[PDB]
Every structure is written in structure tokens, then in C-alpha cells.
Design a protein around this ligand. Structure first.
Ligand SMILES: CC(=O)N[C@H]1[C@H]([C@H](O)[C@H](O)CO)O[C@@](OC[C@H]2O[C@@H](O[C@H]3[C@H](O)[C@@H](O)[C@H](O)O[C@@H]3CO)[C@H](O)[C@@H](O)[C@H]2O)(C(=O)O)C[C@@H]1O
Lengths: 260, 263, 260, 265, 265
């Protein structure tokens, strides 16, 4: 692609606004936004996580207004994003485990992963396994032909984030060797007791242009939005723990760009 | 609206200065600024929090000087905010029926989950409902997401409301709706965890500019300014181990100017 | 006051001093410490002893007399820092061992670090943790307290006009006043909070407002106020005392012409 | 070398690669982990096994060959100008469901946490190392390259301990640091976060660039058309059901942009 | 007294060196460590041994001699303009195998953690000190230089306690701080991080420069062509298997660029 001039005028811009729901595992009809209770296999060899226990990446493919070698493409220029429902984590009165005698429920805390991406094509994934002997369950899409090298880097594990409730968070990351046409941002905050720190504002914009002033270019007039918002773990009265996730809002401003 | 020029001169500017009190539940005549002690339900199905156990959003509707005889009109535009949590040093009272942190020690200070939030708008803050637990029974006297479903635990677009009443909208059920709020500027931080330390900064030297990327602030419909806040600072643990939310008031000073619009 | 031009040339002066902390000083050996904390069994019986209450520090500094349409001293810049930060490395003076054979628990827990520069007394607003607290003789505290005093009672207005008198826990700078003062403070709460104290002679704070005007010194007096509660010292017994440190101030002033 | 003008026009190249971590790999299933940590019975008997010691990672990357023809008083060198880098596989640390120790009764497994070292360098020659020992009486194992003729001074600064990071799986992290008195032709960056419970904080983005130019606008100059990349990404320790702890490391991605620079040699 | 123009051309020099820590060095094997910490039986009987007290480090570095010929109303002085600095040997704190106290049953040794003081200064004369005592009744030991004629006022501010950092291994860290009322000809920077579980956070890079010029564009001016470097790098405490705890320190690297400045008497 040779990138030429931006189109100007009233009809040269469009905006996408939507929310991606989290896919934490949803172990029953009452537990949307939660995983199944976490269990611990006795050995790496016996690690066989239940589908319902594995958070997955969220993805939405958004069709844009139809535009057309010498063509126009939608270019993603800005992003506003927000985690939706941060105050829900103040419910410390619902089937929780008291922190001490007579105390309030222990709040959602521990390992979090907050991730979002905007691209002109599916997010490209690289597989990395904590334990190459993990048996990923039917219904998930996971690194195939895993070897002990999969624990650090096995270049065979390439995928596209092209399906919902399918790609487990723990075995996939954005592939830094690809994703030229995507902007991605993520933070893993580890530890058993790390407190969530969640900021909300409608005053913050991320610019998606690269160092050449070029944003993601939407192939086939499709925009790809991806997210993960594992906020931590909910501890119930028994001490068992479940991942808890929240939805993510996206607002993307796009402009027409001529390319060859 | 088409937004046109700012009016200048002595008469073109006004200021709002006020404080919003916290609405933490106020369980008796001695406990203004505190919630009821927290109780925990023994199942998701049995969650039934009492009204005095639920912190609520604070809101004030501030009438501004009348601009038009009949509403090509003038509107008050909010341009700058100075804000501060009032009484941060009260959290140094570690001698008042607190739980000793160890044998012969001082009282445990207020700590744990906090929510610090403020907004300035030309209309009521627009809320989206999100529920930790869709089967929670919210109490009479509160305004809460209705017709809740399991989808209410992640995103149910039915739960739309206006922050239009004080001591009514529970903090835990509602957030600013990011799909709306074009005419409001909002800012909030949830710091979770039972041990997190409050970090509270005070200064009279800090200003927030409320102008958007087009140089336009909140425009006050009907000449009303809307101020909203939550300042849940954490939990107070008393000698028994019982925990209560503790809140503090928030100071607002907003500078406004007259702006011509075509509406 | 119409504020007119700055004088140039005899037109500048500097104030440099240390403000000592007022932590309660419970005996002849314990300057910089409070009495050990004791806890009431009810809110209604909260009756803290004077030597258990840290107070605001204040100094009124007479400047060179002006005007034998007048000149006023304008405060323009501040250098400040906490003096004696390294004294908190004394972990051998009859403290509580962190574990068997261990060093003494260092000073830690709730801190309040606060400083102000003004051309008049710092203006205060009272806020009470517990409106039924009985404040002791020889302190100046919110009077006619009601339950509304726990969140905001506008009757509680005062001037920081006396050293060792205004308890820290029942007063804050009044944000509705203090037009002629610049103040800065941080409360860090929690029994395990680590002190984080920075020292440098390279950092300057500008005291000019949005209009280029610093505090103007009424009657040619500069007002410096401070609190530096660093945390609590834990004795071998488990008893805890507030520990405070002195604050250095260097203020540069210039002569400014004003009308009345 | 006096640095002259940048060549313009085939005047720019890119290196993209990843460096695997070298944590000790104690068996055929534990690539990316160390052996479980054992504690010596006395300070003077410290004697860590090779598979218990994380080492520095290094790769030397050949660049397009310059100066094929005889030149007179001048050569071209590849100059490293920008870096994008990140840790690969940060989400793997969300596996709290295998062989772990419950945080509390009925809880999930304790995640990887505790001491971390995150380090990367880009240079026109091998990273220069200085040795500093926690304990000068530590017996370092066969197959490692460690500070030799150690004395009690080695615990603070013994200027004899000079080395080049010129071998993978060999230089123990705990023995060596970048030599701040050398490394003129390298840019290095590292953070040690100590403590038994410290939580990993790992950021990923493809939007962040580090500029490698010094205060004169000159990046690392690649001697012999070779680029040296070095890394350590000890993320923390994994705790087994038994309580035994193993270091866990992750791979590092590098993308380096280079331009041809004329120099008077 | 009057600072005039910078000399150009011969006109620039660099100082590069390390300052070793002075943590107390309680025996021939324990350079960089203090004596294990003991606690007094009463507040009034506090009496720390010399080898239990970290001290300030100082080096005076001779610069190229200036003003070899008679001058008239003016001299040249070396002016310190920039500083690169870093802690040397940060990775040594990853030794969790050397007879430390296990974090839990079968776990690795507790890393160095707890209270830290990281301090450095560059000046054209000795660092000026002010004494502040935690406890004015502490008995400071023979071989140290400590605030004398201590009173209860010494616990917050006794202006009698003025000193110069003019001797290595002598001025205990806990007794002394930079005097903010003096030090016009020094630039100093320090952070105290207090608490028994405080994790070390130590960054290393050769890409960060501190500018030493004041608001008038003048750096420290070196009296008698001597540059004073001072440091403290108490990284935390090491916990032995027994539970006993020792301060652990590390060396600090300094690189200072200086230029010749003309000054009028
Ligand atoms: C820093 C400090 O001084 N620490 C001491 C502490 C404080 O002085 C107070 O808590 C301040 O309010 O006092 C500690 O002992 C409290 C008891 O003191 C007993 O008196 C003793 C005294 O401790 C000794 O210094 C003296 O040799 O003998 C006195 C008479 O026996 C009181 O009788 C008893 O009621 C308590 O007040 C404390 O642990 O709180 C000791 C600290 O070292």
C-alpha cells in the first residue's frame, strides 16, 4: 500500500461507538462476567482447565460505510475507551468472605489483565504457554503441537483473533512481530492481593496514528476491536475464587484515506 | 447547537462555589458521613442490602443568572474547575472506638476500597447500570437498575438513568454512561482492596480546564449547572471488627462565561 | 487591592527558617513525639489528651518595614524540605522487633505532609471524624459541633493564629478562602504506609497565581504553616507515638506597588 | 571514529528478533524456569547449582555487509536509531491452576511474584560487564562465567571483574551488571524490583519507541556490521504446592531501525 | 564571587569513579554489610556499636591544576555541569540462596528489603550537614562524628549541630542530613523509603543525565581544583536464617563533566 492524501469535507469522517462484553467463562445462567471457581491440578502434566474456568479475548468486527488498486480506505485516527461498571466492585455484601471477624467481604483483587486494540484487520496472536503440557478444553482455540519451547517462544503458534469465547487469555498475546495495521495496549498486574486501580473519564483521547501520521487502514471496510478486562478474582464465602470481568466501551473516529 | 463566539467584558463571567456533602447512608443521628456496618449475604440469591448500608451519588443543580427572556441564545459555558476533598485530616482520628492494629497499638485508620468521582455538566449526569450480582434486592427509597437480568452483570442497555436526585442512586449500581455525557466532564478512580491506603492531596493551586478538543465547555441548559461527586474514602473498622464506609465532602469552584449558540 | 508594577533594583528580600513540629511533646525527653495513642470504647467517650494530638505549626515572620498607594512584599518562590529524614533509620532504640532476633519496626503508618506560604494567617475549616470527641483544654477546636460537623458545618471557621493549638485531625485549609495563601498537603492513611521522603536543594515552587501575583504580606508579615507527621514509632510494648520532623522554608520576596 | 553524515536513499535496514530467557532449565519440561531454590546451611558454604542461576541472554545479529570496496580514510557503519521492545507471553502468568500453592484455603494458586529483573541493551559491540558479588565466598558452578579471584572487596567494587557478554547461558544475572565506566557504544536499561511478594507489572504495546541517539545525535555504531542485543526478564518466582520456588522468565522482542553513517576511521 | 564567561577550546574535563558504601563492615568477610542490628532494653539506653551504623561516603577528586601563573583580579575554576550516576551491582540482591531466612517452608531466602536511603551530591566543597537525632539520649560510639551537646531540641532542630562531610566512614547516616540553609555550591538529591517490607526499586541506564546548573546557569565551582562527591546507598536489610538483620549497601558510579569558568575576586 502507497498511502496518499486524507479526504476532507463533511462526508470524509465517520465514528464507531460500541461496547465489548467480557468472556470470563460464564459457568451458569446466573454468572455472566465470572469464571468457574479456580481449581489447582496436582502437576503440570495433569493440568486440564475446564472451558468455563478460562477467560477469553473479546473481539468485534464492525462493518463501516462501503467506500469503493487506487481506492479509499477508512483510517482509524482516535480512540476513547473506558471500563464499564467499575463501581460494581464496591459490592462487598454479596456471598463474600469476611476479611476478619465481623468484617466486610473481601473485594475483587489479584491478577488483572486490561487490554484493548483497534485494527484494520484481526489482531494477530502469538501463543506462549505457562506449562506446555496444559490440556486446553474442547471449544477453545489454543497452541497446537506444543513443545517445551512453547513455554518461552515457539513461532509455530500463530493465530488471528477471529472468534469470540474461543481464544484463552492465558495462552495468547498480541504478536509483536506482526500487527503493523493494529494499535494494541495491555497491562498485566500480577500478585494474589493487588488492588484494582480503575480510572474513568470522558476527557481522554488516544491518537492511533503511527510515526508516519498513518492510522489503522480498514481492509474490506471492517474495523476490528479487541479487549480483555479481567479485573481480578472474586472470593466467595468458602474461599473459592472466580475471575471477574467488565465490559469495555470504544469510540473510534475514522477518516477516508486514498491509497494505491 | 452551532456554538458561536464567547462574550467578553465585566458582565460576561460568573463563578459557582459550593460543597457537596457525602451520602454514605447515615445509619443513626450520630453517624452522618458513615454507612451502616456492612453485612454479608450467605448466597447471591439472598443479597438484600439496607438503604443505610449503600453509599449514593451526591448531586447539586445550581441555578445560574437568567440569560434569555425566551429560550439564537446565550448559554453559560463551564470553563475551569477547582476541586478538593474537605476534611482529609479527620482520618488521623485513630483514638475513637477503632480496632487496635496490634496489642497496645493505635486504632486502624480508614482504608480499603475507595471511589473518588466528580463531574461538571450543563445537564444531569447520564448513568448506565452495572450490577455485581443481578439478583441483589435493592431497597425502597433507592433508584436502581430495574428488570435486571444476568446480562445486567456486564452490560444491559435498558439501565439508563439521570443523576437527578440526591441520596438515591447507589454508587455500586451506576456509572457514568460513556455512550452519552457529551455535555458533561467526569473523572473518577476506583481503588479496590481491603488494605489500600487513602492518598488525598489538597492544594488551592490546581485548576482543571473543562474545554473539549473544540475549545467548548459544558453548556448549561435552562441556565442550570450540575455538580456530582462520590468520595468514599474507605472503611472505618470499629473495636468489634465491624466495617462502615466513611465519606467526605467535596469543594467545587467553577468559572463560567457567556457563549452565543444557535439552538 | 489594585496590583500594579513590581519594583526593580533594594527591591528583593529572602526569608529562610526551620518550623519545628508540634506532635504533643508528652515529657521533657520527647520533643517531636506524641503521647502514646489510647483508644476510646465508644464515640461518645473519645477524649484525647492534649499531648496525644499533633497540631499545625505556624510562624509569623516580620519583613523589612515598607511605607515608613503603598508597597507590599510579594512572595514569589519557595524551596522547602523535611529536615532529618535519616533519623527514621534508627531501628535500635527500644522498638518492637519485626520478628525474633530482628531489627526494630521503623516509623510507618498514617502521614500528613503540609506546607503553606501566605500574606496573612492560613484560613481553616473544621471537619470532625466524630462530632462527640471532647478536645482538651489548651487546644482550639470546632465549637458547638453537631453531627453535621462530621461532613461540613460552615460555623467552624478559624485562623491558624497560634502555634501548638490547632489539632491537625479537626482542621483543614478552607478552600472557600485562602485567596492570599498558597497551600499544599498530602494525607497518606494506613498503619503500614512506608514514609517516602525526598530531599534536594534543586527544586523551586513558584507562588504566583494565574494572574502572576504571589501572596501579598499584610502589615509586612509573612505566614509559614506546616505539618509533617511522618508516621508512628512503635515501642517494644506495642504502644505507638506520632513522630514529626521540622520543615525548612526559603521564600524569595519582591516589592509590589498596590492601590489600598 | 569521527562521525560524519548519514547516507540517504537502501540506506536503512531493520532487525526483528526475540531473545529466549535462560533461567536454568532444570529438566526437559521446565524451559523458562530455574531449578527450585535451595538455601546454603552457612553463609560461607553458598554453592548454587548451574540450573538454579538465571543468566543474561545475548544475540549477535549480522547486518548487510558494508565497505565491500577499498575506501580511503572513511567507512560506512550501521547506526542503531530506534528500538521497540516488549516481553512476550505476559498472559501466561494467569495460569494459577497447576502445581501451585493455594493463596488461602480453597483459593487459586499463588501467581509468579517476588524479585524481578527486566533489562535490555542494544549495542554496536558486546555489552561490557562489571562483577559485584552478594557474597564473595559463593562457589559459582562449572559452566558459568563468574568473577574470578573474588575478595571481600568484590562485595562492593573490585575493578578486576571486567567481562563481555559474549556467551549465552553463561553469565549469571546475580554476578554481573552493565559496567557504567564503559558501554559508550551501547544503550542499556534495567530495573530491579526486589521483595518476596512484589507483583509483576508488565505493559505491552506496539506504539512505544525508544530513541537510541546520544546527546550528539549518534546511535550505537555496529563494528564489523554486527548488532548486539542483550536481555534479562526474570518475572519473579513460581511457588509449587510444597512451597519450593523457581525463577520464571519470558522472551523479549526487539525491533531495531538502523541507518548507514559515514565515519572517519 | 562574580561568575563571568565559560572558556572554550583544553576547556573541558571528566571525572569518572565509584564510591564504595560504608555500612559498618563488622569483620574481614562482610564489606558492604553492617553488624546485625541489636535493640536497646530501654529508650534512654540506646547505644549503637560503630559497626552497626552506616555512614556517609565521600571522595574528594583532584582536577587538572588551574591558575599556575599569577593572575590579576580573576581566576579560572572548574564548573560541574552534568552528572550520570547509578547504583553498581543491583543484581547481587537476586542472591536468595546464601543462608537467608526462608520466606515460608521450602521457599527461597527473603531478599534484601526494608528501609532504604539513596543519596548523592556533587559540589565544589564539602557537603554541609545539619544534625537531627531520633533520640537525643542515644550514645554514639567512639570513631564516629555525631551531634555533640545533644539536647531534647536535637530531636527536631538544634542549630548547634553543623558539620562538613570531610571524612569517610565517620558521619553516621541516621544523625546527619544535608543542611538546606547552606550547600549553595553543592547539588544534592536523596530519597528515604521507610518500612520493614519496602521492596528495593533500582533503575540502571547509561542514557540519563542530570544537569547541575542552578537557575542562573552556574554549576558547582570547584575550590582549590577539588570536586566533592558524596553518597549513601543503604538498599535495605538482609535477614539471616536466625532472623538477625544487617544493612546492605552498594557502590555508586559518578560521571561528572566540568568546564573552565572565569570568576572575578
Ligand atoms: C519513645 C519513648 O519514650 N518510649 C517509651 C514510652 C513513651 O514514653 C510513652 O508511651 C509516651 O506516652 O513509654 C513506654 O512505657 C510506658 C509505661 O511507662 C511506665 O513508666 C516507666 C517508664 O517506661 C521507664 O522509662 C522508666 O524507667 O520507668 C518508669 C516507671 O516504671 C509507666 O509506669 C506505665 O504506666 C507506662 O506509661 C511505653 O511502652 O509506652 C516505654 C517506651 O520506651
Amino acid at each position: 500500500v502507497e498511502v496518499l492524501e486524507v479526504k476532507t469535507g463533511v462526508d470524509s469522517i465517520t465514528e464507531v461507538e460500541c461496547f465489548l462484553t467480557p468472556e470470563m467463562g460464564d459457568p451458569d445462567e446466573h454468572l455472566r462476567g465470572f469464571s468457574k471457581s479456580i481449581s489447582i491440578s496436582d502437576t503440570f502434566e495433569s493440568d486440564s482447565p475446564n472451558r468455563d474456568m478460562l477467560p477469553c479475548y473479546s473481539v468485534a468486527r464492525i462493518p463501516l460505510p462501503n467506500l469503493n488498486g487506487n481506492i479509499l480506505m477508512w483510517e482509524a485516527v482516535t480512540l476513547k475507551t473506558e471500563v464499564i461498571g467499575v463501581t460494581s466492585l464496591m459490592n462487598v455484601h454479596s456471598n463474600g468472605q469476611a476479611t476478619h471477624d465481623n468484617g466486610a467481604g473481601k473485594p475483587v483483587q489479584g491478577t488483572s489483565f486490561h487490554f484493548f486494540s483497534v485494527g484494520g484487520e484481526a489482531l494477530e496472536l502469538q501463543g506462549v504457554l505457562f506449562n506446555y503440557r496444559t490440556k486446553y478444553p474442547d471449544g477453545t482455540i489454543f497452541p497446537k503441537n506444543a513443545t517445551v519451547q512453547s513455554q518461552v517462544m515457539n513461532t509455530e503458534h500463530k493465530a488471528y483473533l477471529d472468534k469470540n469465547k474461543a481464544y484463552p487469555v492465558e495462552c495468547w498475546v498480541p504478536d509483536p512481530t506482526r500487527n503493523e495495521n493494529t494499535r494494541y495496549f495491555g497491562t498485566l498486574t500480577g500478585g494474589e492481593n493487588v488492588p484494582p486501580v480503575l480510572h474513568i473519564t470522558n476527557t481522554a483521547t488516544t491518537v492511533l496514528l503511527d510515526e508516519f501520521g498513518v492510522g489503522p487502514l480498514c481492509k474490506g471496510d471492517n474495523l476490528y476491536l479487541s479487549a480483555v478486562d479481567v479485573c481480578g478474582m472474586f472470593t466467595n464465602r468458602s474461599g473459592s475464587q472466580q475471575w471477574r470481568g467488565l465490559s469495555r466501551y470504544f469510540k473510534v473516529q475514522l477518516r477516508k484515506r486514498r491509497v494505491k
